[PDB]
């Protein structure tokens, strides 16, 4: 699925997390469109061999299991292919847990590059929540 900007919003708040750790709505579609432009099937494979999965490109290094990540975690309990479908419900609970784990958003990198200090609201801008 290829979602439009407010179409996750609405779908993003619905499953909680506007406001999650403090991080505002626009800061979570800002990454989801800098991860993925929104396409909750994009896959980019790492330098290290692990891979990222769907619509905020979870990295099966620490995180879930596509069986080709030698000695890599899955901390969120889900075979990465879960991350690609057109329901974000496994993405926005595994993300719940990264946000979680004391690095904050900071852990997507293109969030702490394009997203981190800038005007996020404006990603959220004409949206019915
Ligand atoms: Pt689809
Ligand atoms: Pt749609
Ligand atoms: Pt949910
Ligand atoms: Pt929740
Ligand atoms: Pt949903
Ligand atoms: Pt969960
Ligand atoms: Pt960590
Ligand atoms: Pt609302």
């Known amino acids: 699925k290829v ?3 407010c179409e996750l919003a609405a779908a993003m708040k619905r499953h909680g997390l506007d406001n999650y750790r403090g991080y505002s709505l626009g800061n979570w579609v800002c990454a989801a469109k800098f991860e993925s432009n929104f396409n909750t099937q994009a896959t980019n494979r790492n330098t290290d061999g692990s891979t ?3 619509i905020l490109q979870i990295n099966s290094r620490w995180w879930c299991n596509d069986g080709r990540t030698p000695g890599s ?4 309990n889900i075979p990465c292919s879960a991350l690609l479908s057109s329901d974000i419900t496994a993405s926005v609970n595994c993300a719940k847990k990264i946000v979680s784990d004391g690095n904050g958003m900071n852990a997507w990198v293109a969030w702490r590059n ?3 200090g800038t005007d996020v609201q404006a ?3 004409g949206c019915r929540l």
Do not use: V
């Open 3 to 5: 979602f439009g900007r």
């Open 52 to 54: 990222d999965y769907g």
């Open 73 to 76: 975690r899955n901390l969120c």
């Open 114 to 116: 394009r997203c981190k």
């Open 123 to 125: 990603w959220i801008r």
